[PDB]
PDB file of N, CA and C and ligand atoms in Angstrom:
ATOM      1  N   UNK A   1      -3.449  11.142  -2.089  1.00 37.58           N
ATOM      2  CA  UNK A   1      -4.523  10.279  -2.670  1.00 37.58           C
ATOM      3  C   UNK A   1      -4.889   9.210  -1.638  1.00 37.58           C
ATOM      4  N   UNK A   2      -6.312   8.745  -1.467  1.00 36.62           N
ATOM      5  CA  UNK A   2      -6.022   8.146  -0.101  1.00 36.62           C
ATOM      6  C   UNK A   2      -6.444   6.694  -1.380  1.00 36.62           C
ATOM      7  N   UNK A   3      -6.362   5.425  -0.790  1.00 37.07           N
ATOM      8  CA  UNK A   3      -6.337   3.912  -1.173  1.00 37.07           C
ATOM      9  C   UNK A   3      -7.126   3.211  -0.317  1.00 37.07           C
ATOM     10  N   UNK A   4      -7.995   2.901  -0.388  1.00 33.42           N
ATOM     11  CA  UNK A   4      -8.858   2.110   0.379  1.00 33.42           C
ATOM     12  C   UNK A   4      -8.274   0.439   0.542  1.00 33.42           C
ATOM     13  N   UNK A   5      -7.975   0.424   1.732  1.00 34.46           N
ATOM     14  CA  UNK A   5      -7.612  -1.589   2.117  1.00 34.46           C
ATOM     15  C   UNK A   5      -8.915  -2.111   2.779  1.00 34.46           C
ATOM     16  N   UNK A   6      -9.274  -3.165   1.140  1.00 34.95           N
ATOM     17  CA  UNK A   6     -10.643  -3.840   1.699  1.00 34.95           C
ATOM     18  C   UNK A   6     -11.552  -2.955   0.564  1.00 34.95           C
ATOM     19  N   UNK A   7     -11.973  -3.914  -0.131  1.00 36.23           N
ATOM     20  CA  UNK A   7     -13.455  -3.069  -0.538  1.00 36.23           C
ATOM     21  C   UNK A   7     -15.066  -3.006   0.233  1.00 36.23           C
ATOM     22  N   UNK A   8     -15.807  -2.327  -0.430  1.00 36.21           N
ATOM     23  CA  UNK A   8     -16.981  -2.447   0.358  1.00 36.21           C
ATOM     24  C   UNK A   8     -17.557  -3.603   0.749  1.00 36.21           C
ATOM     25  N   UNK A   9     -17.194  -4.393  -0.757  1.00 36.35           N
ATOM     26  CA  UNK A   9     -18.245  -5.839  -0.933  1.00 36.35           C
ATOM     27  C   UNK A   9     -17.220  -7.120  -0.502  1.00 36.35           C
ATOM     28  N   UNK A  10     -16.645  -6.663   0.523  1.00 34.96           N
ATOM     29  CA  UNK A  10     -15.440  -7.670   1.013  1.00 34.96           C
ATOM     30  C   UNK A  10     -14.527  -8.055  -0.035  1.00 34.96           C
ATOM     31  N   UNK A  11     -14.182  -7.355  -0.737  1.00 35.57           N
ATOM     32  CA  UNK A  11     -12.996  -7.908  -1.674  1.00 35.57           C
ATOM     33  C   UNK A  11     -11.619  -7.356  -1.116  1.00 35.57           C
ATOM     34  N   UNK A  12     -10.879  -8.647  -1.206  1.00 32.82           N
ATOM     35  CA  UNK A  12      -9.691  -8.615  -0.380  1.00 32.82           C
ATOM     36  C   UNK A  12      -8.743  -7.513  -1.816  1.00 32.82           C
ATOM     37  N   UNK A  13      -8.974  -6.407  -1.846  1.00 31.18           N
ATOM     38  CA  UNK A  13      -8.323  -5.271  -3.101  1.00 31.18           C
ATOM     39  C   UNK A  13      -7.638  -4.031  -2.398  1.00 31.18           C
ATOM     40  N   UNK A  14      -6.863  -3.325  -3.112  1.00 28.79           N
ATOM     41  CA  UNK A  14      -6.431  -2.259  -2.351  1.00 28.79           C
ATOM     42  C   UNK A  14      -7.292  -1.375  -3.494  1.00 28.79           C
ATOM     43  N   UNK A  15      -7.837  -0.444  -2.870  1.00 27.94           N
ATOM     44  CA  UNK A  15      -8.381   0.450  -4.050  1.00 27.94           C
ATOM     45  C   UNK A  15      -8.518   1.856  -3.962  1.00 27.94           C
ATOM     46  N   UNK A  16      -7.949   2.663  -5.494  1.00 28.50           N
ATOM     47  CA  UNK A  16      -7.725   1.804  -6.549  1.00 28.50           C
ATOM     48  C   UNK A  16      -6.411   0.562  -6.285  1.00 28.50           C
ATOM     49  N   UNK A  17      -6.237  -0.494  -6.832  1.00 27.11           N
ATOM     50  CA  UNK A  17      -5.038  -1.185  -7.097  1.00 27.11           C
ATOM     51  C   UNK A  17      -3.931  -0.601  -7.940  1.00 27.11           C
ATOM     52  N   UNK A  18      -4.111   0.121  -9.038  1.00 27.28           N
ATOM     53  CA  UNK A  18      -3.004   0.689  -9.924  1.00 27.28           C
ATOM     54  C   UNK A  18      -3.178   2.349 -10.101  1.00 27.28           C
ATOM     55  N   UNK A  19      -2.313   2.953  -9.330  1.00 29.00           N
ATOM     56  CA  UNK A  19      -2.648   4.536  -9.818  1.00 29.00           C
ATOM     57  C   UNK A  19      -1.511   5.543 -10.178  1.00 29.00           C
ATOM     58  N   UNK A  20      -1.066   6.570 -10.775  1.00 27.39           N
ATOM     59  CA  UNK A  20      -0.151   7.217 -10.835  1.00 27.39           C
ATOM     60  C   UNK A  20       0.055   8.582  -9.915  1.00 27.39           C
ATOM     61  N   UNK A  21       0.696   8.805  -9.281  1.00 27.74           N
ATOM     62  CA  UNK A  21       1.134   9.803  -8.209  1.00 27.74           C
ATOM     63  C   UNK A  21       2.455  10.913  -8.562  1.00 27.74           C
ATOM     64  N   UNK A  22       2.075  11.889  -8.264  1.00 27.81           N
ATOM     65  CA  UNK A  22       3.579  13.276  -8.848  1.00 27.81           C
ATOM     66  C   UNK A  22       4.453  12.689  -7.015  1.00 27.81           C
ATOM     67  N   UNK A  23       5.832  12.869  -7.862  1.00 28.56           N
ATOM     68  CA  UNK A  23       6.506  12.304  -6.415  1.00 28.56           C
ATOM     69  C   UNK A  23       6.349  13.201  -5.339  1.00 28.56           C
ATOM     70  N   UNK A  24       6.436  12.591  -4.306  1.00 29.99           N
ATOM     71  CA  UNK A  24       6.205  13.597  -2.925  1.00 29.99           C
ATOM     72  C   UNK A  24       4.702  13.816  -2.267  1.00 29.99           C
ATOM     73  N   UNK A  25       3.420  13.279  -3.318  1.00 28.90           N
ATOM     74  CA  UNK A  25       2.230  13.680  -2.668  1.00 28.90           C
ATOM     75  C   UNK A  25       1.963  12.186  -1.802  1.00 28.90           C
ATOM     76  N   UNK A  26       1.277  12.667  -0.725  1.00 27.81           N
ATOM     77  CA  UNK A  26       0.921  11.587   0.373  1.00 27.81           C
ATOM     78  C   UNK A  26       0.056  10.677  -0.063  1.00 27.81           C
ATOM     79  N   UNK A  27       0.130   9.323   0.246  1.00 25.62           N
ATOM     80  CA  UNK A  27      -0.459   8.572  -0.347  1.00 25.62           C
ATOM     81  C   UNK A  27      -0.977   8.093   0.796  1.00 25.62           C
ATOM     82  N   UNK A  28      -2.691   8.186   1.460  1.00 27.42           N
ATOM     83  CA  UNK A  28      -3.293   7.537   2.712  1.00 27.42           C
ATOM     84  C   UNK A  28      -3.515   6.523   2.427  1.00 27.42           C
ATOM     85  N   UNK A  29      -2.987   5.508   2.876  1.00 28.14           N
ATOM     86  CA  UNK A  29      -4.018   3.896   2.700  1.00 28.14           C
ATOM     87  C   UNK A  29      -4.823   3.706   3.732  1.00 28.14           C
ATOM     88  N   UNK A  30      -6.333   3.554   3.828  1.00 30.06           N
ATOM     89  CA  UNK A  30      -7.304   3.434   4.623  1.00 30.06           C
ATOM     90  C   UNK A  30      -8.080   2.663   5.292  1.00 30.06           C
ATOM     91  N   UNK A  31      -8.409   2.013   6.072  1.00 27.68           N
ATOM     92  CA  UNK A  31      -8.660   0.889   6.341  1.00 27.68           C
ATOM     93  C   UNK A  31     -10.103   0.718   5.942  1.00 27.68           C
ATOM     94  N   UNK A  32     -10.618  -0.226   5.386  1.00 24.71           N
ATOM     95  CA  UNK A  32     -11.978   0.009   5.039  1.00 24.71           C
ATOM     96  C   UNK A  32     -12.790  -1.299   5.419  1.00 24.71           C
ATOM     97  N   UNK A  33     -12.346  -2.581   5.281  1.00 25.51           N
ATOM     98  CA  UNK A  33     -13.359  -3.500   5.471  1.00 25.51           C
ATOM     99  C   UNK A  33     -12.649  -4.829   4.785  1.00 25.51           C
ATOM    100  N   UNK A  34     -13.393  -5.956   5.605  1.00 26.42           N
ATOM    101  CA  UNK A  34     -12.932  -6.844   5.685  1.00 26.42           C
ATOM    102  C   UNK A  34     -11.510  -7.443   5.816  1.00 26.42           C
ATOM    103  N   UNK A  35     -11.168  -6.802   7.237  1.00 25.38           N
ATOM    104  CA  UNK A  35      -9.464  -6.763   7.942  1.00 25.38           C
ATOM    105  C   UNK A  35      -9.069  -8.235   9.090  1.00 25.38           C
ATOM    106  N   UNK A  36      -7.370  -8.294   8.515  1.00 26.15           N
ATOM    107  CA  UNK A  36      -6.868  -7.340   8.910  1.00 26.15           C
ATOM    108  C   UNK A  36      -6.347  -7.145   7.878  1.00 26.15           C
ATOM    109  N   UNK A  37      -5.451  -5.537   7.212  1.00 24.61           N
ATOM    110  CA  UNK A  37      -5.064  -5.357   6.555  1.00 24.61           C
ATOM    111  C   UNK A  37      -3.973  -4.914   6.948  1.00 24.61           C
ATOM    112  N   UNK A  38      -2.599  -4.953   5.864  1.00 22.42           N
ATOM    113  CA  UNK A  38      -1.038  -3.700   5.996  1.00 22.42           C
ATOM    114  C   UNK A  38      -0.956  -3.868   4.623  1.00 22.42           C
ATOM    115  N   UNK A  39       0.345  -2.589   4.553  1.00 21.47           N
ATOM    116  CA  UNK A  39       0.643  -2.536   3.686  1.00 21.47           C
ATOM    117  C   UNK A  39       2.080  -1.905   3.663  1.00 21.47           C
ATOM    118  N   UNK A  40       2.893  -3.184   2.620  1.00 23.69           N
ATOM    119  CA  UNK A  40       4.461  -3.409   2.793  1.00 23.69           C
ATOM    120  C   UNK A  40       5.141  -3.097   1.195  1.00 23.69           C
ATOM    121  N   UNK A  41       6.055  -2.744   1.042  1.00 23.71           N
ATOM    122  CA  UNK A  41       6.557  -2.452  -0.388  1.00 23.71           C
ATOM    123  C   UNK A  41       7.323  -3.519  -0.855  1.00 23.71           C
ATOM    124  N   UNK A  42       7.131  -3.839  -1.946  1.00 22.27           N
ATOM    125  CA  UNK A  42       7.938  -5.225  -2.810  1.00 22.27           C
ATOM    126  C   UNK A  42       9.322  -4.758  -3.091  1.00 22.27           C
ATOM    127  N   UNK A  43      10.463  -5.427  -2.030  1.00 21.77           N
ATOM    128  CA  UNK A  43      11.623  -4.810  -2.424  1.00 21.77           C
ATOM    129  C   UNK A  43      12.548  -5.423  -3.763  1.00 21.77           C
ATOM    130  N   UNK A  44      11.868  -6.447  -4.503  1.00 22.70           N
ATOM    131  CA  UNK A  44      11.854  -7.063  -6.018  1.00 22.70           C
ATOM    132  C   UNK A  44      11.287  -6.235  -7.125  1.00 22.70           C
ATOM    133  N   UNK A  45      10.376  -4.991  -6.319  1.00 17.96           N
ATOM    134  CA  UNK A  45       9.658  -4.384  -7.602  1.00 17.96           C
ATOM    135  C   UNK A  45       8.980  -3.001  -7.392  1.00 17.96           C
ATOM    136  N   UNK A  46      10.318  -2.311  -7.016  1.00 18.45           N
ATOM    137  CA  UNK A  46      10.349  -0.728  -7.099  1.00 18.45           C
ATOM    138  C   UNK A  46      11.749  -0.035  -7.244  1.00 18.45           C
ATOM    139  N   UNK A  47      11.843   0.688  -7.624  1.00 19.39           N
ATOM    140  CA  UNK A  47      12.822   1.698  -8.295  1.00 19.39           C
ATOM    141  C   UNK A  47      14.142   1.528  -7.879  1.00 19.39           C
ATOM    142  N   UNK A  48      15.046   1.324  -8.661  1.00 22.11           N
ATOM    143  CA  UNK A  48      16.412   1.154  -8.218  1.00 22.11           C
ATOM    144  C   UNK A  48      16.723   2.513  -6.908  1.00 22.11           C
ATOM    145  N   UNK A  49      17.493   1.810  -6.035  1.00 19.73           N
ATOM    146  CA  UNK A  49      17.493   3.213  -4.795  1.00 19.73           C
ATOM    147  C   UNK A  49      17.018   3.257  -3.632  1.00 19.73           C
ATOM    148  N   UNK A  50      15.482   3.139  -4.373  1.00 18.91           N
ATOM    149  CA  UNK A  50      14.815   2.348  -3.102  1.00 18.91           C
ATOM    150  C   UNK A  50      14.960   1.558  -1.626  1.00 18.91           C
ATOM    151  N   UNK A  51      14.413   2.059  -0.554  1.00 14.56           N
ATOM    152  CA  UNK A  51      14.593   0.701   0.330  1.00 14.56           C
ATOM    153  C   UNK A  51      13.410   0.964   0.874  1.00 14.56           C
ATOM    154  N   UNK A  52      12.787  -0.321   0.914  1.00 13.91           N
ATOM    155  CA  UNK A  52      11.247  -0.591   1.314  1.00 13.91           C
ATOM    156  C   UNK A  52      11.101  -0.727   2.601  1.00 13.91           C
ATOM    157  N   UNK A  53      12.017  -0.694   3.671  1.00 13.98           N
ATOM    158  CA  UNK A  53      11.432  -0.309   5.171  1.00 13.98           C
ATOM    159  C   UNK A  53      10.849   0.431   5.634  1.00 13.98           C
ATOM    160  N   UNK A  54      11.568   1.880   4.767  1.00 16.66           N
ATOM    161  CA  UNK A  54      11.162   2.697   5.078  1.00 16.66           C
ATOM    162  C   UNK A  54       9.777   3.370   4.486  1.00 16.66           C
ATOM    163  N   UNK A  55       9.179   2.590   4.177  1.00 16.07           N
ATOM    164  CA  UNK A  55       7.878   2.882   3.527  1.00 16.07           C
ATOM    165  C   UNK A  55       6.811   1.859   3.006  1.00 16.07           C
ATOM    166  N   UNK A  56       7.077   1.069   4.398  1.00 17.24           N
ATOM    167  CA  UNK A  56       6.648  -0.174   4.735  1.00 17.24           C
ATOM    168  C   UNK A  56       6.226  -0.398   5.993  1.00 17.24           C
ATOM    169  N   UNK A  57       4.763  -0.876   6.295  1.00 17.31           N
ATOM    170  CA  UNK A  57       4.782  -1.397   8.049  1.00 17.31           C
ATOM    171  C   UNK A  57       5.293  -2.130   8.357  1.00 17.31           C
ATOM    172  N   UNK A  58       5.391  -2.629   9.277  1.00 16.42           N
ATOM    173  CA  UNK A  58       6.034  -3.824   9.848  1.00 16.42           C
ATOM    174  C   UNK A  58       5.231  -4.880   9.703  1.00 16.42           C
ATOM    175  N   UNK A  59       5.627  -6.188   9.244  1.00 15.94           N
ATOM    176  CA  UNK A  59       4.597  -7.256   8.193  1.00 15.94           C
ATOM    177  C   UNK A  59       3.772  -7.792   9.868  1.00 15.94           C
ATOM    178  N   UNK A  60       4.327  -7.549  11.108  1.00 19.34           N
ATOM    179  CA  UNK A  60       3.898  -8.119  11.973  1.00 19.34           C
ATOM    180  C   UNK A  60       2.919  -6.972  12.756  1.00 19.34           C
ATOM    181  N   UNK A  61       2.333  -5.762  12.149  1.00 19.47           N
ATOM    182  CA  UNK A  61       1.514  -4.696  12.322  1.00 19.47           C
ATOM    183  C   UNK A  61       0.132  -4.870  11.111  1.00 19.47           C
ATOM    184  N   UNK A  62      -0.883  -4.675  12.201  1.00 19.25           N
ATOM    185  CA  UNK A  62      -2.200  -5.107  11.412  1.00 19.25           C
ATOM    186  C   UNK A  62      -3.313  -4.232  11.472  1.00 19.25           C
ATOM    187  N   UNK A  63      -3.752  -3.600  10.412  1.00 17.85           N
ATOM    188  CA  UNK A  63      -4.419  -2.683  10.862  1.00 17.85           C
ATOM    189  C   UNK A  63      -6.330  -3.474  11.010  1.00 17.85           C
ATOM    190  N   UNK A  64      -6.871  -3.158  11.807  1.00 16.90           N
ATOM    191  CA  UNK A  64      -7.965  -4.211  12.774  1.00 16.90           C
ATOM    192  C   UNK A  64      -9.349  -3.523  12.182  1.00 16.90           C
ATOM    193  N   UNK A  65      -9.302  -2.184  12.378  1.00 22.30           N
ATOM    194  CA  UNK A  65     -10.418  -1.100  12.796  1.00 22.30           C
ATOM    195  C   UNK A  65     -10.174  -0.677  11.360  1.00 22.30           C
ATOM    196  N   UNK A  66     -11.951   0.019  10.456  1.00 26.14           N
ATOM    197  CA  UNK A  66     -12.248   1.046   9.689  1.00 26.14           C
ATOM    198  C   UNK A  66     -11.374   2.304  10.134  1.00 26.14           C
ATOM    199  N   UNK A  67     -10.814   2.906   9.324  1.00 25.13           N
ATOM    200  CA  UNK A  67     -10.404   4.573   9.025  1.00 25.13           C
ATOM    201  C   UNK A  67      -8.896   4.581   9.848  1.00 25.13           C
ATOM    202  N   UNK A  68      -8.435   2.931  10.299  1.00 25.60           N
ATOM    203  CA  UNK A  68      -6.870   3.244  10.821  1.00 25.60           C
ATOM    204  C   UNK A  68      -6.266   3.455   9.512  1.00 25.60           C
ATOM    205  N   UNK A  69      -4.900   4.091   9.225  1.00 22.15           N
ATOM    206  CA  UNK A  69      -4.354   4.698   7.997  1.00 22.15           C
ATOM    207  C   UNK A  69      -3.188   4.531   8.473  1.00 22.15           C
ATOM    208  N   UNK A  70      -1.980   4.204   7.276  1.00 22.91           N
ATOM    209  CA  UNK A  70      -0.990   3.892   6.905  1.00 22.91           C
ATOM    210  C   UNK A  70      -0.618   5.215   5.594  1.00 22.91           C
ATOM    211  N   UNK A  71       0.492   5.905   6.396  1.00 19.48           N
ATOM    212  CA  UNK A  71       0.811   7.408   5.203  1.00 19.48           C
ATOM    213  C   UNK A  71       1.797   7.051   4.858  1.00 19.48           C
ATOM    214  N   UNK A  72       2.460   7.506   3.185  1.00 17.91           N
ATOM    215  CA  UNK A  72       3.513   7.504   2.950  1.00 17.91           C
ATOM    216  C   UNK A  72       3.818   8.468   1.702  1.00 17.91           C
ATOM    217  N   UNK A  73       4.878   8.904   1.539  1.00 15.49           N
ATOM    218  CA  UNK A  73       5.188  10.057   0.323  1.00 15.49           C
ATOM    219  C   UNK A  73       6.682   9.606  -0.256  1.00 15.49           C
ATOM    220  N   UNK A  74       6.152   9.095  -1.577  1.00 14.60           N
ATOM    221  CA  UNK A  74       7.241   8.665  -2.492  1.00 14.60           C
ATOM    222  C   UNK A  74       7.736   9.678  -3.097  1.00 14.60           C
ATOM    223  N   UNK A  75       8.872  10.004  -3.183  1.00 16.80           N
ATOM    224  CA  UNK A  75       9.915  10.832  -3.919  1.00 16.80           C
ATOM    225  C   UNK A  75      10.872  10.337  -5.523  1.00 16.80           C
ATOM    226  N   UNK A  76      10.930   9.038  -5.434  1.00 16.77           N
ATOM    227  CA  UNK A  76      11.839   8.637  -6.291  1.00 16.77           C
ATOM    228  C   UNK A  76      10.852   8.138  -7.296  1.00 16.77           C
ATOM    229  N   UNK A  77      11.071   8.651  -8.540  1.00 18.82           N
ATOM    230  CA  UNK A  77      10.175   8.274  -9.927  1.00 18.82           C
ATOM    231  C   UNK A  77      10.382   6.748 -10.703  1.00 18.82           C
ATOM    232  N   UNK A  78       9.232   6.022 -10.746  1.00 17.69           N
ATOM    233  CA  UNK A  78       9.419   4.640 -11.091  1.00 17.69           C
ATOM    234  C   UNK A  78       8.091   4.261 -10.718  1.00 17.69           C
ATOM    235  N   UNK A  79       8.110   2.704 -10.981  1.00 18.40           N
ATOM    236  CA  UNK A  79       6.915   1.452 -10.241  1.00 18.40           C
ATOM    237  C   UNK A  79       7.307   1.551  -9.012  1.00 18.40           C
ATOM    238  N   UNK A  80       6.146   1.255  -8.394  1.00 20.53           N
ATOM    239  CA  UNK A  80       6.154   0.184  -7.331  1.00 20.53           C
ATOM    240  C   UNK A  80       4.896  -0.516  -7.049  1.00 20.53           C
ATOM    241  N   UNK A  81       5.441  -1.500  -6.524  1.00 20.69           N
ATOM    242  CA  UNK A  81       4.452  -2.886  -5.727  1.00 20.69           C
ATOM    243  C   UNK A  81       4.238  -2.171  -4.196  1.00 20.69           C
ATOM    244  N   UNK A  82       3.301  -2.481  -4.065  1.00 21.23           N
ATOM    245  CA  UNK A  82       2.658  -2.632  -2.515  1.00 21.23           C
ATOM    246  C   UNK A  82       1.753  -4.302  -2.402  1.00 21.23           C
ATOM    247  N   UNK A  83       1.357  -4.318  -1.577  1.00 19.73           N
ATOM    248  CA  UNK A  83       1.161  -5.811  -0.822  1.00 19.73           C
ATOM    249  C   UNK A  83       0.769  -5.792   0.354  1.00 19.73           C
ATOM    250  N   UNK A  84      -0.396  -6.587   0.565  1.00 19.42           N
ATOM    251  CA  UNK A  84      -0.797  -6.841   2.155  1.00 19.42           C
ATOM    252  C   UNK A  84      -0.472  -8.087   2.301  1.00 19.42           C
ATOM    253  N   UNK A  85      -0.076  -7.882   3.597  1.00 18.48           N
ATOM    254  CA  UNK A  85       0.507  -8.739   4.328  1.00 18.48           C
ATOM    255  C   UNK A  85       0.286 -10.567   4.082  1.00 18.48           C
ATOM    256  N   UNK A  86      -1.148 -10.008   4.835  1.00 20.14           N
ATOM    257  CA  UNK A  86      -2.216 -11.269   4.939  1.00 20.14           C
ATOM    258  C   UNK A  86      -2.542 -11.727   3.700  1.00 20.14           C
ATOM    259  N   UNK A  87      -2.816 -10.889   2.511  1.00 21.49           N
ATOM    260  CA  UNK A  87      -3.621 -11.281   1.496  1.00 21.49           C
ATOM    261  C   UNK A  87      -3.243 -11.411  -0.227  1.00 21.49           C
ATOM    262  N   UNK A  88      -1.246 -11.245   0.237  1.00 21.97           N
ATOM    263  CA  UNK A  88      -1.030 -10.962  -0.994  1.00 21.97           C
ATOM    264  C   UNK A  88      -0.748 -12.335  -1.214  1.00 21.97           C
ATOM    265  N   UNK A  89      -1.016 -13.668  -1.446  1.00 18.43           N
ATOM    266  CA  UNK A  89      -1.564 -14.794  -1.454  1.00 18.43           C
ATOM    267  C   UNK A  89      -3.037 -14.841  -2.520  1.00 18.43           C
ATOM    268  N   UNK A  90      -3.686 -13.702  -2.425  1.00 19.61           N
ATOM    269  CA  UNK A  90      -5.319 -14.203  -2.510  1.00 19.61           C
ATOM    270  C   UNK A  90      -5.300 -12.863  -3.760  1.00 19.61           C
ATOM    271  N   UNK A  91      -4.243 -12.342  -4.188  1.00 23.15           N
ATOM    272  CA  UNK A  91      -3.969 -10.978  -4.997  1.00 23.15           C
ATOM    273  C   UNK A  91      -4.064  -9.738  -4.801  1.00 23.15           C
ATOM    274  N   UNK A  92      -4.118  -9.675  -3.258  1.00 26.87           N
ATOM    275  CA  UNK A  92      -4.556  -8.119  -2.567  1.00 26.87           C
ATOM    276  C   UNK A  92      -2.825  -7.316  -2.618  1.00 26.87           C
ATOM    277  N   UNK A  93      -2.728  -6.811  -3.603  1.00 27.29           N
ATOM    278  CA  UNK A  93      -1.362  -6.508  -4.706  1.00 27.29           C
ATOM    279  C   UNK A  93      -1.735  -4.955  -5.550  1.00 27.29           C
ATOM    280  N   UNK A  94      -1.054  -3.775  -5.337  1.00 25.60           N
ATOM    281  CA  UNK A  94      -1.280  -3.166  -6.397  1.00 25.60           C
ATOM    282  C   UNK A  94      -0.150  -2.536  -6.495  1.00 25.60           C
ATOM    283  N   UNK A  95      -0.120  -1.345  -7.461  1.00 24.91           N
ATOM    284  CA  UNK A  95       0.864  -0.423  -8.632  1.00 24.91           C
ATOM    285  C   UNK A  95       1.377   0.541  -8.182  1.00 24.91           C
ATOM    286  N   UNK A  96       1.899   1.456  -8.081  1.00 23.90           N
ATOM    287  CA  UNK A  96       1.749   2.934  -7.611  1.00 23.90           C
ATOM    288  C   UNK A  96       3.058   3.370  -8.910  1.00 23.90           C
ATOM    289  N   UNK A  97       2.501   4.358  -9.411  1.00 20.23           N
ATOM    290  CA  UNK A  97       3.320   4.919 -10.560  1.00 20.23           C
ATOM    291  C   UNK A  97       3.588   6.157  -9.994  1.00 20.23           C
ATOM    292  N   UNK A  98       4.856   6.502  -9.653  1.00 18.60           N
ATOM    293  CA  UNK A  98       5.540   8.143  -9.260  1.00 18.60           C
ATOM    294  C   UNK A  98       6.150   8.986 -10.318  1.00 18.60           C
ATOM    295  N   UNK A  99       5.592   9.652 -10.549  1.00 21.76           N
ATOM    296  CA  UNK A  99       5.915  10.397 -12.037  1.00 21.76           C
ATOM    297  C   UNK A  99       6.193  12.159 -12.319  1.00 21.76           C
TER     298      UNK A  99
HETATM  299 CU1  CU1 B   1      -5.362  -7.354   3.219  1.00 22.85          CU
END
């Protein structure tokens, strides 16, 4: 499923923000507009087991440019938080349901 970082109309959003995913399918996050954008996993608010490095950029990696992409494929069934870097301050925050 790909996730757009940045909406069209400059809204600092990941979109969609809340979606549900079967575990294991790739999830593209995309760079779209009004950057810089990343995207890091809330290690307060995903699935017991979990470790968010590994499916996390590095908070000091920024993606600059339209259509740079950030991949990842969740396996373990639960919530999770994602978060940009820069903007999860301003609510650029969403869901990902693995089911
Ligand atoms: Cu952002």
């Amino acid at each position: 499923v790909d996730v757009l970082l940045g909406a069209d109309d400059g809204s600092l959003a990941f979109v969609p923000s809340e979606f549900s995913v079967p575990a294991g399918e790739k999830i593209v996050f995309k760079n779209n507009a009004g950057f810089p954008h990343n995207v890091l996993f809330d290690e307060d608010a995903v699935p017991s087991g979990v470790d968010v490095s590994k499916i996390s950029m590095s908070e000091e990696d920024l993606l600059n440019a339209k259509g740079e992409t950030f991949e990842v494929a969740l396996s373990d069934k639960g919530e999770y938080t994602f978060y940009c870097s820069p903007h999860q301050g301003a609510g650029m925050v969403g869901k990902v349901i693995v089911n």
